[PDB]
Structure formats: C-alpha cells, structure tokens
Swiss-Prot record, chain A:
Belongs to the universal ribosomal protein uL23 family. This is Large ribosomal subunit protein uL23. InterPro entries: Nucleotide-bd_a/b_plait_sf, Ribosomal_uL23-like, Ribosomal_uL23/eL15/eS24_sf, Ribosomal_uL23_CS, Ribosomal_uL23_N. Keywords: Cytoplasm, Isopeptide bond, Ribonucleoprotein, Ribosomal protein, RNA-binding, rRNA-binding, Ubl conjugation. GO terms for molecular function: RNA binding; rRNA binding; structural constituent of ribosome. PANTHER family: 60S RIBOSOMAL PROTEIN L23A (PTHR11620). NCBIfam families: PRK14548.1. Component of the ribosome, a large ribonucleoprotein complex responsible for the synthesis of proteins in the cell. The small ribosomal subunit (SSU) binds messenger RNAs (mRNAs) and translates the encoded message by selecting cognate aminoacyl-transfer RNA (tRNA) molecules. The large subunit (LSU) contains the ribosomal catalytic site termed the peptidyl transferase center (PTC), which catalyzes the formation of peptide bonds, thereby polymerizing the amino acids delivered by tRNAs into a polypeptide chain. Gene3D superfamilies: 3.30.70.330. It is found in: Cytoplasm. One of its GO terms (cellular component) is cytosolic large ribosomal subunit. It comes from Saccharomyces cerevisiae (strain ATCC 204508 / S288c). One of its GO terms (biological process) is cytoplasmic translation. SUPFAM superfamilies: Ribosomal proteins S24e, L23 and L15e (SSF54189).
From Swiss-Prot, chain B:
Present with 238000 molecules/cell in log phase SD medium. The keyword Ribonucleoprotein applies. One of its GO terms (biological process) is maturation of LSU-rRNA. GO terms for cellular component: cytosol; cytosolic large ribosomal subunit. It holds the Pfam family Ribosomal_L7Ae. Component of the large ribosomal subunit (LSU). Mature yeast ribosomes consist of a small (40S) and a large (60S) subunit. The 40S small subunit contains 1 molecule of ribosomal RNA (18S rRNA) and 33 different proteins (encoded by 57 genes). The large 60S subunit contains 3 rRNA molecules (25S, 5.8S and 5S rRNA) and 46 different proteins (encoded by 81 genes). Its main location: cytoplasm. It is found in: Cytoplasm. SUPFAM superfamilies: L30e-like (SSF55315). GO terms for molecular function: RNA binding; structural constituent of ribosome. Belongs to the eukaryotic ribosomal protein eL8 family. PANTHER family: RIBOSOMAL PROTEIN L7AE FAMILY MEMBER. The lineage of its organism: Eukaryota, Fungi, Dikarya, Ascomycota, Saccharomycotina. This is Large ribosomal subunit protein eL8A.
Swiss-Prot record, chain C:
Belongs to the eukaryotic ribosomal protein eL34 family. It is found in: Cytoplasm. Component of the ribosome, a large ribonucleoprotein complex responsible for the synthesis of proteins in the cell. The small ribosomal subunit (SSU) binds messenger RNAs (mRNAs) and translates the encoded message by selecting cognate aminoacyl-transfer RNA (tRNA) molecules. The large subunit (LSU) contains the ribosomal catalytic site termed the peptidyl transferase center (PTC), which catalyzes the formation of peptide bonds, thereby polymerizing the amino acids delivered by tRNAs into a polypeptide chain. This is Large ribosomal subunit protein eL34A. Signal peptide: none annotated. Present with 23600 molecules/cell in log phase SD medium. Component of the large ribosomal subunit (LSU). Mature yeast ribosomes consist of a small (40S) and a large (60S) subunit. The 40S small subunit contains 1 molecule of ribosomal RNA (18S rRNA) and 33 different proteins (encoded by 57 genes). The large 60S subunit contains 3 rRNA molecules (25S, 5.8S and 5S rRNA) and 46 different proteins (encoded by 81 genes).
Curated annotation (Swiss-Prot), chain D:
GO terms for cellular component: cytosol; cytosolic large ribosomal subunit. SMART domains: Ribosomal_L2, Ribosomal_L2_C. There is a cross-link at residues 45, 92, 118, 144 (Glycyl lysine isopeptide (Lys-Gly) (interchain with G-Cter in ubiquitin)). One of its GO terms (biological process) is maintenance of translational fidelity. This is Large ribosomal subunit protein uL2A. Transmembrane segments: none annotated. Component of the ribosome, a large ribonucleoprotein complex responsible for the synthesis of proteins in the cell. The small ribosomal subunit (SSU) binds messenger RNAs (mRNAs) and translates the encoded message by selecting cognate aminoacyl-transfer RNA (tRNA) molecules. The large subunit (LSU) contains the ribosomal catalytic site termed the peptidyl transferase center (PTC), which catalyzes the formation of peptide bonds, thereby polymerizing the amino acids delivered by tRNAs into a polypeptide chain. It is found in: Cytoplasm. Pfam families: Ribosomal_L2, Ribosomal_L2_C. Its main location: cytoplasm. It comes from Saccharomyces cerevisiae (strain ATCC 204508 / S288c). The lineage of its organism: Eukaryota, Fungi, Dikarya, Ascomycota, Saccharomycotina. Component of the large ribosomal subunit (LSU). Mature yeast ribosomes consist of a small (40S) and a large (60S) subunit. The 40S small subunit contains 1 molecule of ribosomal RNA (18S rRNA) and 33 different proteins (encoded by 57 genes). The large 60S subunit contains 3 rRNA molecules (25S, 5.8S and 5S rRNA) and 46 different proteins (encoded by 81 genes).
Amino acid sequence: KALKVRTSATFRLPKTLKLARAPKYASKAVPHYNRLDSYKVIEQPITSETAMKKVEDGNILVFQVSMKANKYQIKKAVKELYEVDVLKVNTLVRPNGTKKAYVRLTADYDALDIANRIGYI
Amino acid sequence: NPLTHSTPKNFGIGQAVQPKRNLSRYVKWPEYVRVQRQKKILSIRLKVPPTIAQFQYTLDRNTAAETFKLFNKYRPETAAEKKERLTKEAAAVAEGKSKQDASPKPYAVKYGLNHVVALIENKKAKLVLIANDVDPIELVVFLPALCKKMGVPYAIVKGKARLGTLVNQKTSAVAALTEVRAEDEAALAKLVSTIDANFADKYDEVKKHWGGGILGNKAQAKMDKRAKNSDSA
Amino acid sequence: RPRQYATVSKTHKTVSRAYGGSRCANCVKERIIRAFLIEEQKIVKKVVKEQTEAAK
Amino acid sequence: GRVIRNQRKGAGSIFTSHTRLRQGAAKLRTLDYAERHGYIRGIVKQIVHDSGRGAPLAKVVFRDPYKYRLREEIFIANEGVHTGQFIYAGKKASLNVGNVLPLGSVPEGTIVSNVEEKPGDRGALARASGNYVIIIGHNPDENKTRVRLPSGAKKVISSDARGVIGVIAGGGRVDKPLLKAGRAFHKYRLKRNSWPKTRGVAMNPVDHPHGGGNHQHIGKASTISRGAVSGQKAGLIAARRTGLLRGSQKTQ
RNA sequence: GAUGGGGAAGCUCCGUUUCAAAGGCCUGAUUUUAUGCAGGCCACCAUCGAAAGGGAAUCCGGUUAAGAUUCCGGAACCUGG
RNA sequence: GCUUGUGACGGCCCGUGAAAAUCCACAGGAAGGAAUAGUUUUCAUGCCAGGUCGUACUGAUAACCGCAGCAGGUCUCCAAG
RNA sequence: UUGACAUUGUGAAGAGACAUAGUUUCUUUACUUAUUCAAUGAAGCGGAGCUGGAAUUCAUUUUCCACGUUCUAGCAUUCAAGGUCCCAUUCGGGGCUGAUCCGGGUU
Ligand SMILES: [Mg+2]
Ligand SMILES: [Mg+2]
Ligand SMILES: [Mg+2]
Ligand SMILES: [Mg+2]
Ligand SMILES: [Mg+2]
Ligand SMILES: [Mg+2]
Ligand SMILES: [Mg+2]
Ligand SMILES: [Mg+2]
Ligand SMILES: [Mg+2]
Ligand SMILES: [Mg+2]
Ligand SMILES: [Mg+2]
Ligand SMILES: [Mg+2]
Ligand SMILES: [Mg+2]
Ligand SMILES: [Mg+2]
Ligand SMILES: [Mg+2]
Ligand SMILES: [Mg+2]
Ligand SMILES: [Mg+2]
Ligand SMILES: [Mg+2]
Ligand SMILES: [Mg+2]
Ligand SMILES: [Mg+2]
Ligand SMILES: [Mg+2]
Ligand SMILES: [Mg+2]
Ligand SMILES: [Mg+2]
Ligand SMILES: [Mg+2]
Ligand SMILES: [Mg+2]
Ligand SMILES: [Mg+2]
Ligand SMILES: [Mg+2]
Ligand SMILES: [Mg+2]
Ligand SMILES: [Mg+2]
Ligand SMILES: [Mg+2]
Ligand SMILES: [Mg+2]
C-alpha cells in the first residue's frame, strides 16, 4: 500500500519497551538490619538540673538523641521504649554535636513518675 | 435538515485556523534517515563509471523467480539433516564397511565469496548469481568481468538476503551452481541462455556506458520547460 | 495579594455579568456592540458582492 | 607595551551591551505562507519605549494561522502608526503606512523601513530613529529592486525582501544638544561602556600609539592603513581623504 | 555550568537550545490483574546562582542565672490529606 | 508640629526606571448530572498531619580586620523636652 | 594580503597542439550534488488539473493572468459542521467528502 500519514512535522523518539530488572545475582547477599532502632534513636536521659526541672514542672522528658533521628523517629521511639503518649517533640542541637529532645507527654502520663521509673533521679 | 446545520469553513489566509494535513513531506527526520536518503541522491547526481552501474541492471523478477525456483531444489543440509546423515553414515560405515560412502554425493548451491571466486577461476561454476546490494561494492564489482573472461554465465540479482534465504544465512553476497542432477540440466541451460542474453552478452556494451547525472524533478521540470519555450517559441 | 485569592470565595473574584472578573463592563458593552454590528455588516458585505457577481 | 583600549573591547567583559531593560528584538514576522501569498492582519496592541534605543517599538499581535493562539511580534514603530491600528503584511497588501510589503510589490518612490537584506532576515536596513530607504527602480526579470540606504549607498536586493511603509518614529532626536556630561552619561549608561573617552594622546606610550612626548601630539600621520595590524589601528583608519569637508556632499 | 555535539597531542577549550530520534501529565482501558495499552494533549529541553530582590501562614500576656514571634497560657492562621 | 505610611496629582528624561516561581479570573463547553429523588466541597461546621538545618552572645576607643583589650577601618533600623 | 597546488565535480560558446579529424589546457557563463549562509515547534515547494476571465480566434484554442480575509481596539480551539457510506443499532465509533491530483527536494 501507501505511506504513513504524519499530521505533525516533529519526529520524536519512538515509545519503546522499557524492561524491568531481573538480576542474575543478588545485590548485597544480606539486607542490612534496621540502622536506626529505638534503642539507637534515644541515647541517654539528660539529667541536668534545668532539665530535671522540666520533668517536675512541665511534664517533659529530656533525652539525648541520635543526630540521625528526626522528630518522628523520636516520638515513635519514645512510645515503644517507655509506653507513653507523646504530645509534641521539640529538638535542638546541643553545642557539642548532640541532639536534645524536649519530649512532652499528654496529660494522662506524669513525667516525674515515668522518670524515676526508668531510674534517673 | 433537523436542528443540524451546514456551516462551511473558510480556510483562506487570515481566518479559520488551518486544519490538520498530511505533513509527511515536511517532517524533520532523524539524521540517520536523512543521510541514507541523500546518499542515494548523491549517488545519482554524480556520473557513475561503467564498471559500477553495470549494476542497477538487476535481473527481472520473472527470470529471477525461475532462478529461485531451480536453486531451492539445491539447498545445503539443514541442522538436523547433517546430524541425521552422520548417524546414518557413522553406523553403516564403521560396521557395514561402506567405503566412506554410506551417503550419496551431495548436490547443493555453492556460496561464500572466496569459495565462489576460485570456482569461477577454475572453470567449475555453471551459473553465478551476484547480489546488487553489496555495500563495499568492491567485494563484488570484479565478478562480471571475472565471469566474462571465464566463460562463466553470471547474473546480477536483486536481494542479498534473498540469496541468503536460499542458503540458510541472513545474507549472502553470491550464490552459484556447479553440480546439477540430470533431471534439472534442461531447465538450467534454459535459464542460463536467458541470463547470458541479459548480462554476459551486454557486458562489453554496458562497459562503455556511464550512468547517473540524473536531476531531481525540481531541477528537471525547470529543465523540461526551459528548453521547451526557448526552442519552440 | 495573589496567593490570598485562593483563600477567598468565588463571589469575591467575579461579578455576575459576562466577562466578570476580567473586563470592565464598558469594554463589554463595546465588544458587544462591535460584535453585533460587524456580524450585521458582514451579511451586508456578502449579498452586495453577490449582486456584483450577477451584474458586472 | 600594553594592550590598547580598542583591543580590549573584543573580549567583551565590561564592554557588552547593557541589555536588562530591553523590550526584545525588533523583527518582522517570519516570512510564512500568508505573507508571501496573501496578507495577514494584526493589531498594534501598544507602542513602547525600548531602553537604549532611539525609536519606539510597536507590539503587533497576530493570529496563528496553524494553531488557535495569539502570536505577538515586535516591530519598530513607523511614524504615524498608533495603538489600535490594523497592520497588513503580505505580497498582496495595501500600500499604507505601517504595513509590510515585499519590495517588488511597491512602486518606485516608496519609502519603507526595517527592510530585509535577503528575504526573510526579519529586518536589516533603516532601523534607527528617523531613517528609511527609497526604492529607485525595478528589474522584473531576476526581480531585483534598487534602493538607496540612509548612508546614501544604493544597494540592489531581492524583490521578495520585505519592508514596512513609512519612516521610523522619533526623528530629530539628534538635533538637541546633550548640553552636559550627565545627559551623555545616562545615554551610554543604557547602551554600553563606551563613555567617556580618554584621548590616546593623554596616555603614556605603553597605552596607545599616541602616548608620550614632552608635548601632547600625534607624532606621526594619524592615517593608518587597512593592512595595519591590531594595536596599530587607531586614528583615521584607511582614510581616503582628510580635513574639513568643504563643498556640497550628496553623492552624485 | 552539565548534556548530543564541535576544537585540541592533551590537561581540557567552545556551545546551552546549541545542525540531537532529548521528555510527562491526565484519565480511560482492567474485573485472569496488575498496570500492559486504547485516546488526546505539552514540545516546555538540565541544573547552580539572593539569610537586603520575589515569597503560603501568629499574636498578645507570662516565664529563665542564661532561651523565646520558638517554652507556658490564651486566642488564630496557612498548607497538605 | 515630628517620624513614618499612604493617596490623588504635578516636574523630569537622546535616562521612561528587573525576572521567574506562584495565585486567581475569564473565554470556551468536553463531559456528568433529578422525582420518587439526584448534582453539589470556591457556603458553615467537623478529622488528621506539618519534617530537616540556624536560633547563645559581641557587632566594636576590648568579642570583626588592622601582629594587640591599637585614638584607624568596617552595611543598617528605632530616635523625647 | 597575493599566487600556486589540494578539497574540485557537470554542460555550452570562445581560445590553444600531433601540424583545419577531438584527447587535452585555459578565458567567458551556465548546472547542482561537494562546499558555504540563513530560516522554521522543517506547513503548504515544484509540476499538473479545476473552474472564471483579459485576450483574437486565422480551425479550436495558440496562450497569459488570476484561481475565499481591508469602514470598527469584537469573535475564530474539541481529527468540523454539513453530506455520504459502514458497525448490525445504544450510549458510542469508523471511512470518505468537506479540503483536486502527482513527485516525498523543509524553504
Ligand atoms: Mg528548630
Ligand atoms: Mg602586549
Ligand atoms: Mg550579551
Ligand atoms: Mg566608563
Ligand atoms: Mg576625550
Ligand atoms: Mg575622542
Ligand atoms: Mg600623562
Ligand atoms: Mg608603542
Ligand atoms: Mg606608529
Ligand atoms: Mg605622543
Ligand atoms: Mg595637542
Ligand atoms: Mg561548558
Ligand atoms: Mg536555586
Ligand atoms: Mg530570599
Ligand atoms: Mg527576599
Ligand atoms: Mg514576652
Ligand atoms: Mg529556661
Ligand atoms: Mg537575651
Ligand atoms: Mg503556644
Ligand atoms: Mg487551643
Ligand atoms: Mg484544607
Ligand atoms: Mg528614612
Ligand atoms: Mg511611567
Ligand atoms: Mg485576580
Ligand atoms: Mg472550603
Ligand atoms: Mg516529602
Ligand atoms: Mg538572641
Ligand atoms: Mg564590648
Ligand atoms: Mg580600635
Ligand atoms: Mg584564484
Ligand atoms: Mg521550513
């Protein structure tokens, strides 16, 4: 028969079959375990007197936290490790390259109690 | 006739945006497309010398079809046919004491360039087919001259892959015949005679004729009408 | 300010007549009369040059 | 010695055009089907000041003959054109100020601007405020059209070349004294760093052929040959004559 | 300042939409079923570059030895779902 | 009155005094849509969520640069009688 | 900057030799495919045909032009409505025509 009929003047790259990967050997032989578990997200209580005050007055736990951890990973790692409801989490980087979480609990939980339940005092 | 209505459109300059048309003549093709097309044109605007362009004189489809007709009766062995022939001749020879001849003398088309060349030299070919496509044409150009000096009847045939299909290769520069069972001797000389008439006799005359120098029709019509009016005014 | 127009209801961004939040209602009066008169004169332009073709 | 001033300009660091505020590039429409078979209509939507330019520009919008859309061009405002005017552009087009017509299609004596050197270059000749070209004849076989350019030169170009009827707005601009340095300052401020000009005769010889000496003087003939080499050409390059031009000018 | 490219013995130089087959959205098709293909568009063609340019949206009171339009209290507002 | 903000004007130019992101509107009418019950989330109210990095202090006749706790230098806001 | 050689190919008139047969060499001027310059989301190029018509017919056309838009700061988009033929009539959807043929040389 006769020719194609292109109504447009631009030639464009033909839409060709783009095939997914079926590797013949694995990537790295073992998937790396969870790089930031809860026990790595929160590293130490901060028991400075100005912090211990926030426990007694403002119902807040102060934690030294992994630099790699964000506000979400703190809130989750607090609930799992301490069985508490977290209202909100404020963080700041201490002037020695460490992360400080100001973790505030909902009114159900008394921070002071949960503070000498973990042990520090 | 109902609430429907005829409302013809006015595609004249300055109104009614042009409709979609077949711009196939105008598309901006990829360079690889552009190159091969202009390669064919540049190969036609030049004056091509007669030792080339004795090609482009391709054998006609009918004579060719009868040549593919005969040549197919002489394909080489297939994959299974040779392994089948071996065990048939590995058994009957090694025990039945066949003189390495538990198999009949084969008859097939000869192929491969260097193979076919020495066949012509040694005056063993009876009919040589040459493809018209060979891209380093030097692989082939000297064959019409060679066959002519060796009394070997040759034919330039459209299709380097079509010569390849009949020999189980994707392509094949040449295909020739030397052996033919007596049942097909008569059809051969019949084809050879038509073939010699088209090529091997026209050789010396074609050898004197250049080709090409053929204008595109924009410069052709500008020529057919410029010499039309200038002379017959 | 332009991003604030996304925090306000459509009635604050248009008026009820055609070309509401777009043209100043005296231009609309004008692009109406201009439209109507041109379509009228366009009819006049055809049958005049149709009779031209019948007598010329 | 040092590299002299006119040699530094070609590198274009501090000498490139001061371009931020420009309106765009002034150009005739692309020489499409409509313009070279019929004519196309547009409206000058605005005539506007182009920074650093003498002449005002004319924004003229057309319909796109192939897609449903408006496409706007930037013309140079020919004097007399106005907001709301209809501009026609095409082989068959009326000989009215503001329209653009192929040079072949206007009688002799026509006065046009922004004319193309070869057809389609979208405007080459007679663009500065106050200039124009006049057609002085036609050669229908080979369809040339002899014109006279603002310099006085009489070039012959294709009859398909396009020009716009009229002269370019803003004439007489150069009749007013700048009157003071600042006017010239703000002038070249929006063109390029060509101002002010230290005389080569006030520099030391490192700087310029004219530099040095215990008195301020050129020292040798200031007429420099065409064959002179970069760093030599300063003064009156290839001057075929010199001195106060007395007597009537006006090429014969 | 990458890129198809073009220079250069070469470190590298040039070009930035540049003589390049340059790319992605809406939803329909599915009721093996997950995303292959059936439409139609867009030919826009990297990216870096402003803690004074452009720019979604917060306030007052209280509070520390040292923090606050960021904490507390009360009262809002924007954006996405 | 003073500082600042803003308005409607007026003077000036051979100077006529950025860009993009982003947001809205209109033109358009593709389509989808109710009587035994539909369309509606640019009206009200209600639900969830909002990460990452900076945030101390000095800013100068002592926290900056001038070998220094140097009569030098170093951008700016607020401004009582 | 100037010359020669190479990139360098195709015609025609005009000069030049074995000494007034065409191989060859130049001067003049044509050709387009090398080479060069521009333009464009490579859009309408070239040739022919339709219909009109200036044209005068020296047998019937020998030709040449044309061959959708100009009072107005509107409107122009859904492969187009219309027309025609199909799917087996659904709601949808297609072909042709509208928009003349031919050559794929983007100009
Ligand atoms: Mg923070
Ligand atoms: Mg030097
Ligand atoms: Mg520049
Ligand atoms: Mg200066
Ligand atoms: Mg001076
Ligand atoms: Mg001077
Ligand atoms: Mg001096
Ligand atoms: Mg010197
Ligand atoms: Mg000198
Ligand atoms: Mg001197
Ligand atoms: Mg002097
Ligand atoms: Mg680069
Ligand atoms: Mg950035
Ligand atoms: Mg900023
Ligand atoms: Mg800013
Ligand atoms: Mg306070
Ligand atoms: Mg505190
Ligand atoms: Mg403080
Ligand atoms: Mg609060
Ligand atoms: Mg509240
Ligand atoms: Mg919301
Ligand atoms: Mg002030
Ligand atoms: Mg102004
Ligand atoms: Mg708005
Ligand atoms: Mg709402
Ligand atoms: Mg995210
Ligand atoms: Mg502070
Ligand atoms: Mg101090
Ligand atoms: Mg000091
Ligand atoms: Mg020469
Ligand atoms: Mg083009």
